[PDB]
């Protein structure tokens, strides 16, 4: 029967009609109420970082080798060797990453939870989880799941023969399953799973380049692509051009793609010994004698022999647990011949090739040679056929780009250098970790903050509004999924930032040019104290915030953490940081949304980002508005006469019943307020705006900051909330 | 158009298809994440009972009183006043409760969040909310939401002439949905929504007893009944069976069910002005600009004469501001019609009576007699005719019994009488307040509480695994709901508690003579220091797992709260107690699930009602199998070969991969775990047991507890959860 609905229909634990079945296009803040520190087992307070530096990280190493050559009965190693295995596990955790988005990937070790554990594509890797389990057990906390998933197929690559360039560690391990990431609204998984995303073409060449942003993937439930080709059709040339779409999705070029699949493909098998009706639920659907297992064969023992995982049943190279150019050579050199695998799908064969590619379980077992139709299409487009040739000749350069690619594979969504621990972190600085300079000069202290906060204030062409309005458009670029943005590295001042119409270029370039001023008088002047711009525009903020806070009646401090540098445009590529632009900005109402993501929605989602709690989003409107923050100046949502004083009036007027809110536009983006009793038009708001007079949660929190009397308490959540988005990428600093 | 899906798919904040939707009959850990103190915008600091006591009490209901005759434009007063309106609304807030289960009450306010701002039985409350919402933020944080609902009707009641036995404040704010409560499983609501309720059985007498436990209200949507008549069949006979039933399982007679409709429906009267179809969208479902209301009524100002909530047009009385016994003198006296209102719905009117009956908006005009369906029920059922006919002769009488049913409605999901705030509490204590008495002699000191734990550890008849048990045994009867249950008062010692199956009665029986004697050796020999049993419960508990700790190599001071009186058989009503007996105990391994609701469910249900995290559930059932806890003293579970000591051996020995797990039973309640190696059954494992190494996300915390090294973690984690547990009804140490 019916999707998304259980047969039974529990009165238990959540169960029975939910407010989101009625209702089901009403905004949710359940994003906003994921990963809380109460729902954390180490506790709120773990510090990951200090565990990992402790861990003996050798010996973690050394044991893990270990592991891949002891074969375990439930799941014995194809060739004595779960090397294969276990690089797919690490391949499989860092490639659900999307470039645009920057979800997915493996830093957060979400493939141990739902739904990620239970995706078609990563069959039998919870296999794979159970076998490095007693690694995690051993050393505890002071690794994590998400650390050991992408290590152990680093140390399986090294010990089968290829030297990486190193590792980072630091991702710290999460709790629940994220359900904040779009990965598509199909209603099935692959072999379907993909109507939406193609909007139902079904051509499979001419649709290629037209997958559905930000999506990464060709079906709901695979890596990137297809391993039969586009919709199951063996045509290895379309097989490429969805390859090069999804992995631009990734944001890997032709080189890095190539080099990813035909080093990857060095190594291991498929497996598709049986047919799938042979094969039970998903771990998800699994009963409880699986344990967390799932997939469960019922040919012989299910393992061994006859593992079925892909269905297709394809050994690339004549030493699966050693590295070499043998993939290469055997698709270039290769005749290829359509055939089936004993699960019935898709794959290619040499014809009049030798008989030497061996069993995994029987040595005096051979078979011929075999390809995927995803490996054909290295061969079947010009440039990667023009890579493949030579790499052919010249191993040693696929052996470069392949340790590259790799090392970005694993470390895209880790954030910058300073988050990366462990003793062979990688000296050289990659584009793609949006490098930074070290610091320069000794660092200002509480004294200089105080002097350069009085002389940001008093500089001409800075006022409050423009001072929070700037600093925030420089913290909102952050995102924690992939630990990209943020304030650190004054990347507003550089391409493409600067020219973000959601920035106000004409005004930004005056206001940057009065903290260059004031940079300017600060620097040389101090002794061996020298100031960044990125340090002045979020002190410059801070400092507005203050004065706000001040003329409002509220002394408070609020706090300032020195010491971020100013990145180079050379260390700020334009492509990446394009993913980073906003098309909507609910703090400084700018933009809108779309059919499909409602501008109410594309803010709840940039909180989530931000790690916003509703009330923390809801405190943070409400004083942009009083601050006159917008983007453009506009008074859209200032619903004040104290424009740059801290007060609660945002919400105060939002709830006023003498005002009465209609829609202006067609679109329901622009509404006006009207008081009822003069029938005069008194404000303009937008739908970031009077989404939290809406809501019933979000209008609950609005009800709090516009009780009478809460002055104080508004202005010491705000700093607060504001005091945690300016300090969100600062990695730099500890404890 | 799909039920539970929206028709635009949104790509952001959660938009696209997530875990529960591929896997909807996974257990869900979301009712152990709801009331995080992160989400709350009053801090988790926050301390109601503390503002409430400052509150200016007098003032608030000054202010309640004077808002009821200032009408105001946008939704003008009936009769000039909104007393009626606001009986309804404090009615319905309190009248969504349940006492087999706890659950709905006033308690939490939750008519302000989904689903109940937006049931069709709400209709207009809405504005209700809104009108008060000025009292609200006069007053701040000094009276919650919650409170003030009800405090609004309980001063309307007053102020049209019927004094009340008085007030109880104390409930505080919650700040999302509780998506917890089973409200039935139907996907529509009245005049649907009920054909999973009655098993799609139409017979309307013979049903009326039948409906689905533990449902209170006949269809999703309502709060009781249907004022049409059972499906819209206007048969008063009929509709009085329903009352019955319905009342009754919000767990009140017959003479207060007459009483609080009788009562009620002395005021104001319903809305059935103009046809559905001019009647916009539930709040949940309204645009923007409607700022949370709902309903938008398109005829005229869509308010005043044209107002529309349930579609019936009847005014019960000739005073609808002003207690009268007018209500049962027409129901009785007048012979009724039925006729239709001017929205279509049944009713009934006075045939050839007085036309007296007052038009809400003009002093001049006047109507017949109404009343609905379910009024007539009233004198259509022998035992209501009975009341009704008293009470026509004897009004004191019905004046008496409302007060006390409408006290008892607002007031019987508030907890203990410690937990009643302001200076009108009543003073009777009834015995829906499972009511407790004042200590014996003095409260016992640290050195008393050393001599008790040492004599309980040395007593015969007590050991580690029965202390630890019963104590468990007694406060897994709280639930947050309606903060009835838990350790205080002893009732373990008293009927029903002492002969529940689920309590193992003679092993119970044998520990409580044991502690008597410990409290008999103690109470007059120690001047006039006297412990309770209630504490020596829980002391024996406490002192059972700080030495379970000690051996097993864990040194921590377990810590003791005294204080707990014990209860009187007097106040132990068998009735009111029943409704806490427990299907199963996950906590002790005690029984099995239905065919609606799994073990492992009916676990995560009563871990949400003692407010317990993910991380706290585990912990406290992986201790509870170390310490040989079982209800039973089986070794179901138990898996560890040191039985007694504080160990995490119930997670180490669960995940060892050289155990397989099978089913033994048929009922899926029973496993057997096979040592892979010898073949030897080595455990035997419940459905409660098993989900830990299952459930990703419960599993992944299990695999915390299992790392080598964490003993000492696990010690300190199983104390604090212990620790809360065991104080979770201590609201005289709040007070
Ligand atoms: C277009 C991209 C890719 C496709 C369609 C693809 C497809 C597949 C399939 C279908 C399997 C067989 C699963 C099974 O039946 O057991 C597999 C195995 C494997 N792939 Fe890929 N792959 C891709 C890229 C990569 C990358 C980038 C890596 C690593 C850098 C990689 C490394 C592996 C390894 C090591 C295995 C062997 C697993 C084992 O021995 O058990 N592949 N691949
Ligand atoms: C069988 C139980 C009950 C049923 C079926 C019922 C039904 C109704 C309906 C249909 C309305 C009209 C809503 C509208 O159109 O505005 C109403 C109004 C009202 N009921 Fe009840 N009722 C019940 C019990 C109670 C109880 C227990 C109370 C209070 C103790 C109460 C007090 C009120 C009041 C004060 C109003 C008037 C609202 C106003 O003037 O705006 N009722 N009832």
Redesign the interface.
């Known amino acids: 029967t019916t ?29 906003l ?1 994921q990963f ?7 506790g709120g307070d773990f510090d990951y970082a200090e565990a990992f530096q402790s861990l003996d990280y050798e010996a973690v190493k050394k044991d893990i080798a270990a592991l891949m050559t002891e074969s ?3 799941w014995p190693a194809d060739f004595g060797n779960y090397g294969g295995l276990f690089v797919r596990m690490a391949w499989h955790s860092a490639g659900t990453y999307r470039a645009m988005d920057g979800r997915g990937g493996g830093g957060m070790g979400q493939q ?4 990620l ?2 995706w078609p594509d990563n069959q039998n890797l919870d296999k794979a989880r ?1 076998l490095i ?1 007693p690694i ?6 002071k690794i994590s ?1 998400a650390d050991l998933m992408l290590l152990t197929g680093n140390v399986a690559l090294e010990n089968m023969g290829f030297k990486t360039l190193g590792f980072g560690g630091g991702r710290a ?1 999460t ?3 994220d ?9 099935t ?1 692959v072999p379907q799973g993909n109507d ?1 995303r193609y909007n139902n073409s079904v051509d499979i060449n001419a649709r290629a380049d037209k997958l559905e942003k930000p999506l990464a993937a060709t079906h ?1 439930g695979l890596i990137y692509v297809n391993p039969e080709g586009p919709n199951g059709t063996p045509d290895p040339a379309a097989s490429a051009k969805d390859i090069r779409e999804a992995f631009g999705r990734m944001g890997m070029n032709d080189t890095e793609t190539v080099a990813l699949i035909a080093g990857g493909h060095a190594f291991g098998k498929t497996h598709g010994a049986v047919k799938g009706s042979n094969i039970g639920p998903a ?10 297992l799932g997939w469960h064969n019922s040919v012989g023992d299910g393992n061994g022999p006859n593992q079925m995982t892909s269905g297709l049943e394809v050994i690339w190279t004549k030493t699966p647990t050693k590295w070499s150019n043998g993939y290469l050579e055997s698709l270039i050199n290769n005749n290829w011949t359509l055939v089936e695998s004993p699960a019935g799908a898709h794959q290619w064969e040499a014809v009049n090739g030798t008989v030497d590619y061996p069993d995994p379980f029987d040595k005096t077992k051979f078979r011929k040679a075999t390809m995927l139709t995803s490996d054909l299409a290295l061969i079947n487009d010009p440039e990667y056929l023009k890579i493949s040739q030579r790499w052919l000749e010249h191993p040693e350069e696929l052996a470069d780009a392949f340790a590259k690619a790799w090392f970005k594979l694993l470390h895209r969504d880790l954030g910058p250098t300073t988050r990366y621990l462990g003793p062979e972190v990688p000296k050289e600085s990659f584009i793609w970790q949006d490098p930074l300079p070290a610091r320069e000069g000794d660092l200002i202290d509480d004294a200089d903050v105080d002097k350069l906060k009085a002389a940001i204030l008093s500089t001409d062409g800075l006022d409050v509004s423009k001072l929070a309005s700037t600093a925030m458009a420089c913290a909102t670029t952050y995102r924690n999924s992939d630990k990209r943005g943020g304030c650190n590295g004054a990347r507003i001042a550089l391409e493409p930032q600067r020219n973000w119409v959601s920035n106000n270029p004409t005004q930004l370039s005056a206001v940057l040019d009065a903290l260059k001023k004031v940079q300017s008088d600060f620097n040389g002047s101090n002794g061996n104290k020298k100031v960044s711009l990125a340090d002045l525009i979020v002190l410059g903020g801070t400092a507005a915030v203050e004065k706000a806070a001040k003329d409002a009646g509220v002394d408070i401090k609020v706090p300032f953490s020195a010491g971020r540098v100013d990145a180079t445009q050379e260390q700020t590529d334009v492509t990446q940081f394009s993913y980073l632009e906003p098309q909507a900005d609910g703090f400084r109402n700018y933009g809108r949304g779309t ?4 501008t109410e ?2 803010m ?2 940039k909180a ?1 980002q931000l790690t916003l ?3 923390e989003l ?1 405190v943070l409107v409400g004083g942009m508005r009083a601050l006159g923050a917008n983007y453009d100046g506009s008074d859209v949502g200032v619903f004040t006469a104290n424009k740059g004083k801290l007060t609660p009036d945002f919400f105060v007027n939002l ?1 006023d ?1 003498n005002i009465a ?3 202006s536009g067609a679109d ?1 983006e622009s ?1 006006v307020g009207t008081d ?1 009793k003069s029938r005069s038009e008194k404000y303009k708001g937008s ?1 970031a705006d ?2 939290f ?5 979000l ?3 609005a ?8 002055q104080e308490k508004f202005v010491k ?1 705000f700093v607060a909330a504001w005091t945690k988005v300016m300090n969100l990428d600062r990695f730099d600093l500890k404890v």
Chains 1, 2 share one sequence.
């Open positions: 999707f998304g609905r259980c047969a039974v229909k529990s009165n238990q634990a959540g169960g029975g009609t939910r407010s989101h079945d009625w209702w089901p296009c009403q905004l949710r803040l359940d994003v109420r809380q520190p109460s729902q954390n087992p180490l375990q009965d439930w141990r939870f739902a739904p554990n239970s159970r389990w995690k057990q051993k050393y505890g906390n799941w391990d709790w629940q399953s359900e904040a990431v779009y990965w598509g609204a199909e209603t998984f939406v709901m771990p998800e659907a699994a009963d409880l004698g699986m344990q967390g059919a499909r993501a409602r929605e594309i709840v989602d989530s709690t509703p009330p809801t709830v019943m809110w209609t829609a329901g509404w009822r739908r009077l989404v007079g809406s809501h019933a949660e209008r609950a929190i009800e709090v900051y516009a009780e009478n009397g809460n959540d």
